[PDB]
């Protein structure tokens, strides 16, 4: 049972690393996607005026 506990804690450690990495990457691309939304709004407006 000690060995099995070791294995389960190892799986838990790997999962906790991947979760943190996913959350960080998610935050970066989330900010980027919000900025992308704003920029596309700007380009649509410039298309408004020039058209």
């Amino acid at each position: 049972i000690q060995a099995e506990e070791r294995e389960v804690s190892a799986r838990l450690a790997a999962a906790e690393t991947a979760l943190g990495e996913s959350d960080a990457r998610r935050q970066t691309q989330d900010a980027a996607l919000e900025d992308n939304a704003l920029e596309i709004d700007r380009l649509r407006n410039a298309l408004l005026q020039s058209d």
Partner: protein
């Protein structure tokens, strides 16, 4: 002279009448250009909000 003054008065009258007609037709052209302008901007706005 009677004949010639008759023609003078007649063509003067017809010239005044078509002067009024040109004035009103030019005003109508200005109105239609403004209306077509309004169609242009509002159509652009609607076709873009629909995009």
């Amino acid at each position: 002279l009677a004949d010639s003054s008759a023609q003078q008065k007649a063509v003067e009258r017809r010239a005044g009448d078509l002067n009024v007609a040109l004035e009103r037709a030019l005003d109508r052209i200005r109105a239609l250009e403004e209306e077509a302008d309004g169609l242009r901007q509002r159509h652009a706005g609607v076709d873009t909000a629909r995009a």
